[PDB]
Design a protein around this ligand. Structure first.
Ligand SMILES: CCCCCCCCCCCCCCCCCC(=O)OC[C@H](COP(=O)([O-])OCC(O)COP(=O)([O-])OC[C@@H](COC(=O)CCCCCCCCCCCCCCCCC)OC(=O)CCCCCCCCCCCCCCCCC)OC(=O)CCCCCCCCCCCCCCCCC
Ligand SMILES: CCCCCCCCCCCCCCCCCC(=O)OC[C@H](COP(=O)([O-])OCC[N+](C)(C)C)OC(=O)CCCCCCCCCCCCCCCCC
Ligand SMILES: CCCCCCCCCCCCCC(=O)SCCNC(=O)CCNC(=O)[C@@H](O)C(C)(C)COP(=O)(O)O
Ligand code: SF4
Ligand code: SF4
Ligand SMILES: [Zn+2]
Lengths: 113, 208, 178, 97, 114, 126, 96, 155, 45
């Protein structure tokens, strides 16, 4: 059937959770393909995105898919996929795979003094 | 076993060490140090340039999901060049974890505010500026939040006196509440409560 | 585990009797009438008001009231000028000056406790090694001037001599716990 | 507790609850203000042997934090800080109000 | 001897920000005196603002000048929307404090303070 | 583009908020504190300290308490290095007096010297 | 005992009294300076010397845990009674 | 609250600022009869909460004043850094006593009140059900209070 | 000796009715509407 409410205020109920998750994960993979090959963020985020896309394609049941993904409810999973896509764009802009920008001073992290 | 010693679980230490390696290799541009304490708490010390990317990654990553900011504070250690250590404690409700992100600043290099990432950072960075004088870039409204109106100086600094510089009293000649240079009827008696014998040999610093 | 405080199971449909019940509830003020009724019930109970000052609120022997300096049964002051009370005093409300007495005993020449600075925490009476300083059960010592709350050794000794018949009994009642 | 039966019935009907069973005024059921003297037990360290302080010094077992990576000193599957939190079960006692 | 600027690359636009802040303070002084019912006149309030600026005028580090401009904007905004009250404004004048003369004879006659 | 040059001494006295009397008229002392000779421990002689010059402490007419008029009477600052204390003092604009770390001289300790054939180090008791 | 100065002011057990020309007695003008009448030095001088049969005595001030920490007094000097450092009680060894 | 202040005064001698719970345990052991008096209070206290309900939950004035006022979405509460009753009113299943337990909260059992609308009414209902679950934990503590020492045996 | 300490009774404390207990008292909506209309018609007549 269809979920009456998600139990969280301000979160709508998605009547098509599989298609939305599929297109979000596909967009995430497509924007991750622009990353450099040696980017650890690209490798890891591709790992989670591929695993979650495989699990979504494997499980057609909404409740069993939520229990498999264990990231709360499927609306929360959709929101997390949206935030992961935005984070992937922000990582692509910021380029954090570069070496360390500037070494800290010698006693910057020495505790106690 | 021992009733007076806190029990230790090493699975949390292993998990936090693995996540520290994860974050360190994901962001080598900014992350300067990663440590896990004996209390099983993960601390990641980053460059001030990477405060926005580090906080955004920790909030928006699928494996991190640190969507709740526990607190934002500063520690004044006036023996290092960048004397203010800004500490961000964050909570992940999805993974039931807590993380700490550290960065540094001095009196003349502001760091980027994270109001765009977390909204409580507005008032927390207002508190940090009011107590320590660390400026924050791109803030919506950075102003005093705890001190008196027109209070001069940042009181949580180590070199600021405990009693302050001025005190308020009602003057009947001007019919106002006026500020005087501070005079105490009884001076605060400082106590030298430090034993001359070393307590913890594990933290014995090497001689200079 | 968890539970719902406002969520309701499924639907109770829309029945004519239920609609009539809701209409009667918000047309004849049924919840208002029942709230009036139980406020009337409290009108008809017994008040919980004690008759001050002829009746006093109950307390315990642990009560931290006005400070006092005790004595031995011989009459010698229990205080031995060891300054742990002012060392542990979190508000720094205790000032002690000491010198050897004419017979060479280690006694105080000044023992001042500021009531306006004191936080009434009992740290002095739990750090005192000889049970000299105590927080006796006196609390009705409000003064009309700020000076009268600036106690000295003579005032504290007078309080100890006044309240010794009760302070010693409270210490006898409670000292096995501490 | 000194209320008459008429006033008790009026109060019970007007409030909808049995009030005389649970009175908010304490009358006699409370403990005596004078108690027999206690004898508090001692802790686990109150023994005359096998009680060296080095074997129970939890304060001295604190070590400086282990540096996972440092900028001056220092294919795998992606990890999380902890396994994901198990969903809370609904209350079997009273799930809804 | 090379640092990161806050807002100003060098002393020029830092002085421009100083001039803008002084301009806005000079604008606000009559409104302050009229709205918060100050015993002072408009002239000596502007003199107070000016000699505060001259007190801070000896610094030439662009970062310190930027931070002083920022603090002055906070003080000014705090005066624009009236949270800083009459007592807080009158704290600038020290009219209830007997000043300490700077001559050696007077500092000798008062006490041991240098 | 985001890196400028500054050729000054890092003066922050205008931002510290301290009154000018307690900047210009104060003298600070930078020193490793001496070991308390009533004890033998040396853990308090590891860190550099900055303190301020002692100001007037008079007697309260009411209670006889030690009344003071300066705020920097209990101000003691801890540093890991003399150069760090120097940088802090010059940054805050206080005039400083610095004395070097007094280390104990190494000593030739020999238990057999107490029982010498000919030297004066032989003790007469134990 | 409580004695009075030539000024008429009572002298405390610490020996404190204000001078004739001291201005700080205006706080006692129209009020009273309270002095604790029971002087501890006199009260402990009134106590008789406890005559014990041992070379080393133990004192806790009486009452066990209600007194002072337990100390040991060495009564070797026959020309001087041993005084407790806490309670001020005097002890003398019985050598007969 | 006056009765519970009497409990505070019986354990510490101060009605409000006890300084009773200290690093290493608590300052003193409970006086005799205290557990009996706590039980005598708590066996009657839930009747009082029901009367607070009678003067508030079903009142149309209180419902108008509290319903749909200050509605906070779960994501907004998480981003603003809310905690405790706010998240549970917004519907977030989060309590520190259940997620990151301390002392013997893992040994006691209780329910967590969770709201569904995120308003003042839901927060009030969550606070009342927290009172009731607190009474449940108080019953469990009274039944399962163990013997032994009162501070850590480390001088 | 035997330690004396503040302990629960050996049989344990009794149950505490922590649940919400509204009495669920009240006349029916149909019949209060009926008595109101009946009072109206009687008064009018
Ligand atoms: C009509 C009812 C009037 C009130 C009444 O009779 O109340 C008693 C009594 C009150 O019930 P209650 O709450 O159980 O009584 C409280 C204690 O149980 C019993 O209370 P107590 O034991 O603490 O002491 C009670 C005692 C208290 O005695 C006094 O107060 C004496 C004062 C003397 C002053 C000179 O006597 C009375 O209260 C007797 C009734 C006095 C009514 C006076 C009315 C006129 C006042 C002056 C007007 C001018 O009424 C009833 O039981 C039935 C009321 C309806 C009767 C129809
Ligand atoms: C006027 C009433 C004054 C207070 C009377 C006693 C209050 C307690 C009654 C018992 C109780 O709690 O019942 C709960 C119950 C409420 O129960 P409930 O809140 O569960 O709802 C009833 C059930 N449903 C949901 C189906 C509607 O009270 C009633 O049933 C009374 C309803 C109102 C009756 C009177 C309506 C008209 C009132 C104004 C007209 C003038 C009347 C005469 C006035 C003469 C003097 C000026
Ligand atoms: C009503 C009374 C309320 C009083 C409120 C007082 C507000 C005080 C605001 C203070 C704002 C500042 O301190 S910013 C000014 C400091 N700026 C500088 O020192 C920059 C360098 N200064 C200079 O070059 C100075 O010579 C001048 C005079 C400022 C510039 O002129 P030059 O050209 O020759
Ligand atoms: S009870 Fe008062 S005098 Fe005693 S330690 Fe506490 S604050 Fe100080
Ligand atoms: S702790 Fe007791 S004996 Fe020691 S100085 Fe204070 S009052 Fe006197
Ligand atoms: Zn003794």
């Amino acid at each position: 059937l269809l979920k009456k409410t998600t139990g969280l205020v301000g979160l709508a109920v998605c009547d098509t959770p599989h298609e939305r998750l599929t297109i979000l994960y596909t967009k995430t993979l497509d924007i991750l393909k622009h990353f450099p090959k040696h980017a650890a963020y690209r490798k890891y985020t591709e790992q989670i995105t591929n695993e979650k896309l495989d699990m979504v394609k494997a499980e057609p049941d909404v409740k069993k898919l939520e229990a498999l993904l264990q990231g709360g409810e499927v609306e929360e999973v959709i929101l997390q996929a949206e935030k992961e896509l935005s984070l992937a764009r922000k990582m692509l802009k910021w380029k954090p795979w570069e070496p360390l920008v500037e070494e800290p001073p010698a006693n910057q992290w020495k505790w106690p003094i | 076993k021992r009733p007076t010693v806190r029990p230790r679980s090493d699975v949390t230490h292993k998990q936090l060490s693995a996540f520290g390696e994860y974050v360190a290799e994901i962001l080598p541009k900014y992350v300067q140090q990663v440590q896990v304490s004996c209390l099983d708490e993960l601390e990641i010390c980053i460059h001030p340039d990477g405060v926005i990317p580090t906080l955004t990654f920790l909030r928006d990553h699928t494996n991190a999901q640190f969507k709740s900011l526990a607190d934002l504070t500063a520690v004044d250690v006036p023996t290092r060049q960048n004397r203010f250590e800004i500490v961000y404690n964050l909570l992940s409700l999805r993974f039931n974890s807590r993380i700490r992100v550290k960065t540094y600043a001095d009196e003349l290099t502001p760091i980027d505010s994270i109001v765009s990432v977390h909204i409580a950072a507005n008032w927390y960075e207002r508190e940090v500026w009011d107590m320590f004088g660390v400026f924050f870039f791109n803030h919506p409204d950075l102003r005093r939040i705890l001190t008196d109106y027109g209070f001069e100086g940042h009181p949580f600094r180590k070199d600021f006196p405990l009693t302050g510089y001025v005190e308020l009293r009602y003057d009947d000649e001007v019919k106002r509440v006026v500020a005087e240079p501070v005079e105490l009827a009884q001076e605060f008696r400082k106590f030298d409560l430090n034993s001359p014998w070393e307590a913890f040999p594990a933290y014995r610093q090497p001689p200079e | 585990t968890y539970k719902y405080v406002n969520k309701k199971e499924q639907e109770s449909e829309v029945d004519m009797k239920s609609a009539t019940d809701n209409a009667a509830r918000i047309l004849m003020w049924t919840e208002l009438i029942r709230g009036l009724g139980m406020t009337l019930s409290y009108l008809f109970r017994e008040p919980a008001t004690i008759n001050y000052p002829f009746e006093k609120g109950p307390l315990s022997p642990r009560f931290r009231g006005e400070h006092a300096l005790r004595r031995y049964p011989s009459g010698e002051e229990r205080c031995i000028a060891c300054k742990l009370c002012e060392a542990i005093c979190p508000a720094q409300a205790i000032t002690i000056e000491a010198e050897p007495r004419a017979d060479g005993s280690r006694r105080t020449t000044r023992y001042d406790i500021d009531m306006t600075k004191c936080i009434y925490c009992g740290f002095c009476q739990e750090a005192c090694p000889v049970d000299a300083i105590v927080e006796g059960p006196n609390f009705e010592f409000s003064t009309e001037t700020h000076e009268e709350l600036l106690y000295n050794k003579e005032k504290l000794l007078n309080n100890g001599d006044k309240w010794e018949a009760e302070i010693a009994a409270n210490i006898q009642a409670d000292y096995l716990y501490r | 507790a000194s209320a008459t039966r008429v006033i008790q019935k009026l109060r019970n009907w007007a409030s909808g609850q049995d009030l005389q069973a649970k009175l908010q005024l304490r009358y006699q059921e409370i403990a005596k203000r004078t108690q027999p003297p206690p004898k508090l037990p001692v802790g686990p360290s109150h023994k005359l042997s096998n009680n060296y302080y080095c074997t129970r010094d939890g304060r001295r077992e604190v070590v400086p934090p282990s540096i996972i990576m440092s900028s001056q000193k220092a294919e795998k599957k992606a990890v999380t800080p902890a396994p994901p939190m198990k969903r809370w079960e609904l209350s079997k006692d009273q799930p809804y109000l | 001897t090379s640092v990161k600027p806050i807002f100003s690359r060098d002393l020029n636009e830092a002085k421009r920000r100083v001039r803008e802040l002084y301009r806005a303070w000079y604008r606000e002084v009559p409104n302050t005196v009229h709205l918060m019912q100050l015993d002072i006149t408009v002239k000596q309030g502007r003199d107070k603002v000016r000699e505060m600026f001259m007190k801070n005028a000896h610094v030439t580090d662009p970062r310190v000048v930027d931070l002083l401009v920022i603090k002055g904007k906070m003080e000014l905004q705090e005066t624009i929307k009236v949270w800083k009250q009459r007592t807080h404004v009158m704290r600038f004048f020290h009219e209830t404090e007997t000043p300490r003369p700077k001559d050696f004879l007077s500092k000798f006659y008062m006490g041991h303070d240098p | 583009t985001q890196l400028i040059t500054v050729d000054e001494k890092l003066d922050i006295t205008t931002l510290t908020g301290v009154p000018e009397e307690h900047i210009k008229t104060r003298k600070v002392r930078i020193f490793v504190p001496a070991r308390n000779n009533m004890q033998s421990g040396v853990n308090n002689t590891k860190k550099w300290k900055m303190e301020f010059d002692t100001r007037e402490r008079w007697e309260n007419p009411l209670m006889g308490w030690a009344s003071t008029a300066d705020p920097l009477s209990n101000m003691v600052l801890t540093f890991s290095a003399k150069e760090d204390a120097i940088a802090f003092a010059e940054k805050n604009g206080w005039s400083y007096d610095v004395e070097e770390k007094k280390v104990p001289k190494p000593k030739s300790k020999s238990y057999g010297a107490n029982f010498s054939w000919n030297k004066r180090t032989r003790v007469s008791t134990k | 005992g409580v004695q009075v100065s030539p000024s008429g002011e009572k002298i405390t057990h610490t020996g404190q009294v204000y001078d004739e020309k001291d201005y700080r007695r205006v706080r006692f003008v129209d009020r009273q300076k309270e002095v604790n009448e029971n002087f501890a030095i006199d009260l402990i001088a009134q106590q008789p010397v406890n005559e014990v049969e041992h070379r080393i005595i133990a004192c806790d001030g009486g009452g066990g845990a209600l007194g002072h920490p337990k100390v040991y007094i060495n009564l070797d000097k026959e020309t001087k009674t041993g005084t407790c450092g806490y309670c001020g009680l005097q002890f003398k060894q019985h050598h007969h | 609250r006056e009765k519970m202040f009497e409990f505070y005064e019986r354990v510490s001698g101060a009605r409000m600022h006890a300084a009773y719970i200290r690093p290493g345990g608590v300052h003193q052991d409970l006086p005799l009869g205290l557990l009996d008096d706590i039980y005598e209070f708590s066996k009657n206290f839930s009747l009082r909460i029901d009367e607070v309900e009678e003067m508030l939950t079903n009142n149309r004035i209180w419902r108008n004043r509290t319903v749909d006022i200050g509605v906070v979405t779960a994501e907004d509460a998480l981003n603003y850094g809310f905690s405790g009753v706010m998240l549970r009113g917004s519907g977030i299943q989060w309590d520190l006593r259940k997620t990151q337990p301390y002392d013997v909260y893992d040994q006691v059992e209780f329910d967590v009140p969770i709201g569904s609308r995120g308003d003042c009414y839901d927060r009030y209902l969550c606070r009342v059900e927290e009172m009731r679950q607190s009474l449940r934990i108080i019953e469990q503590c009274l039944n399962k209070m163990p013997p032994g020492e009162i501070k850590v045996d480390d001088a | 000796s035997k330690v004396k300490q503040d302990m629960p009774p050996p049989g344990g404390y009794g149950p505490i009715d922590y649940k919400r207990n509204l009495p669920r008292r009240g006349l029916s909506g149909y019949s209060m509407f009926a008595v109101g209309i009946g009072a109206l018609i009687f008064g009018y007549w």
